[PDB]
Design a protein around this ligand. Structure first.
Ligand SMILES: [Cl-]
Ligand code: NA
Length: 240
């Protein structure tokens, strides 16, 4: 048999090392709109995961003095968004950030060590491969085409009018195309949103430690299999 006939990957922090380009683009957008613009890569790892609206909302709150802890619940029913932060301002920053990022998403960005080999090896073992990401779709499509041509059976990022992860909708779009039962799918990602997306899609999940959340964070948030190399991730997907 096969443990999993389909492996569905998040992009940021999982298959692509994106934090530098995200940082540069966020700081550009902030500067262009009159805000502080000295965010670090570590800041960006706390902002992204839940889509660009939540990411900019988090970044604006952080500029306003919010703790890193407080940012986690942004995008959830328990969010405590400071009165300093408005969606109107979020949208004004995004107007610069989205196109800038799209045009600058492949400067420092590449695959993590081992990932190209992983994809080759999994396809050789007959596993279907997909990307489902909260990165805007336009940037997802460019990156897959340039860095992973012919690798994926399906690739989708966030689009207006379709719910972001951890709603099941985007992964259900993937499941439909791949034609694999959910019990033969595994979702692979670096955050709590990936943990939730898997559960909401009635499939198993593997967490990676080379992305935007720490191991103690992932454990706190319900990760059960956590791997720290691409080889170990291959073994997890194959059940070896
Ligand atoms: Cl995101
Ligand atoms: Na991610």
């Amino acid at each position: 048999g096969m443990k999993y006939k389909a492996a569905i990957f998040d992009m940021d922090g999982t298959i692509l090392d994106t934090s530098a380009d995200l940082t540069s683009a966020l700081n550009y957008a902030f500067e262009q709109t009159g805000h502080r613009h000295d965010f670090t890569v570590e800041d960006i790892k706390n902002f992204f995961g839940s889509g660009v609206v939540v990411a900019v909302t988090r970044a604006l709150a952080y500029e306003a003095g919010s703790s890193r802890e407080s940012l986690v619940a942004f995008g959830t029913k328990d969010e405590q968004i400071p009165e300093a932060v408005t969606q109107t301002e979020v949208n004004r920053v995004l107007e610069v950030f989205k196109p800038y990022y799209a045009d600058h998403c492949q400067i420092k960005t590449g695959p993590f060590p081992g990932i190209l080999d992983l994809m080759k090896n999994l396809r050789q073992k007959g596993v279907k491969l997909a990307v489902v990401s909260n990165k805007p779709n336009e940037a997802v499509q460019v990156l897959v085409e340039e860095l992973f041509p012919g690798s994926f059976d399906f690739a989708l990022g966030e689009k207006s009018g379709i719910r972001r992860k951890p709603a099941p909708d985007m992964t259900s779009e993937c499941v439909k195309v791949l034609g694999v039962p959910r019990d033969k799918c595994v979702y692979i990602g670096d955050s709590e949103i990936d943990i939730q997306t898997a559960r909401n899609s009635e499939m198993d999940e593997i967490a990676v430690n080379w992305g935007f959340r720490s191991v103690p964070f992932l454990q706190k948030h319900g990760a059960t299999v956590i791997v720290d190399t691409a080889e170990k991730l291959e073994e997890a997907i194959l059940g070896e």
